[PDB]
């Protein structure tokens, strides 16, 4: 457990808690875009003349309904990983602080909290996963029905689309880091904590 070891495990661990928080972030700005999206989405069907429109825009809004759910469970997720890393934290500022009274449970209890966050942003790159798949057929779906009766509204649908799935393959950008740093925590973990 040498002190270099001690400084880039905790220093990871501060480096994924402020990606957690940016990821967090993320998801906040998605959320408010999905429900402005279904807004647009449930006026512009309404508003629609052309079944082959009308039929479109359905599809799309029963996807939105279940984004909602899924961004909800994503989301929380997020919010379950960021409480396990403040205990992981605070497992490690005891660990160095003690000694004796003070080992094996505590040494176990930070091993277990790093897996622990590990299964969640496992569950939370698949939400985000799933969700992106929709938003590119999405686009698609919207992309046929361009131009028309509606083309006004049916083009703000698209560029909040296109927008949105830039930060959907953010998020899973960002994921994907955090994937790198939680298993680098861990293992220099088992380092530290054996």
Request: glycine letters at 10%; a negative charge; hydrophobic letters at 30%.
């Amino acid at each position: 457990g040498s002190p270099e070891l001690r400084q880039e495990h905790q220093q990871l661990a501060q480096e994924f808690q402020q990606l957690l928080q940016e990821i967090q972030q993320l998801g906040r700005e998605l959320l408010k875009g999905e429900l402005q999206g279904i807004k647009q989405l449930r006026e512009a069907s309404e508003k629609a003349r052309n079944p082959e429109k009308k039929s479109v825009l359905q599809k799309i809004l029963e996807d939105e309904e279940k984004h909602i759910e899924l961004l909800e469970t994503l989301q929380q997720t997020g919010q379950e990983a960021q409480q396990l890393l403040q205990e992981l934290q605070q497992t490690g500022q005891e660990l160095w602080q003690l000694g004796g009274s003070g080992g094996p449970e505590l040494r176990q209890k930070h091993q277990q909290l790093a897996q622990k966050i590990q299964q969640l942003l496992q569950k939370h790159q698949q939400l985000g996963a799933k969700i992106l798949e929709d938003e590119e057929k999405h686009i698609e779906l919207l992309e046929t029905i361009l131009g028309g009766s509606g083309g006004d509204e049916l083009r703000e649908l698209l560029k909040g689309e296109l927008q949105g799935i830039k930060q959907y393959r953010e998020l899973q950008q960002l994921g994907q880091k955090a994937q790198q740093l939680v298993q680098k925590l861990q293992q220099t973990g088992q380092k530290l904590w054996q």
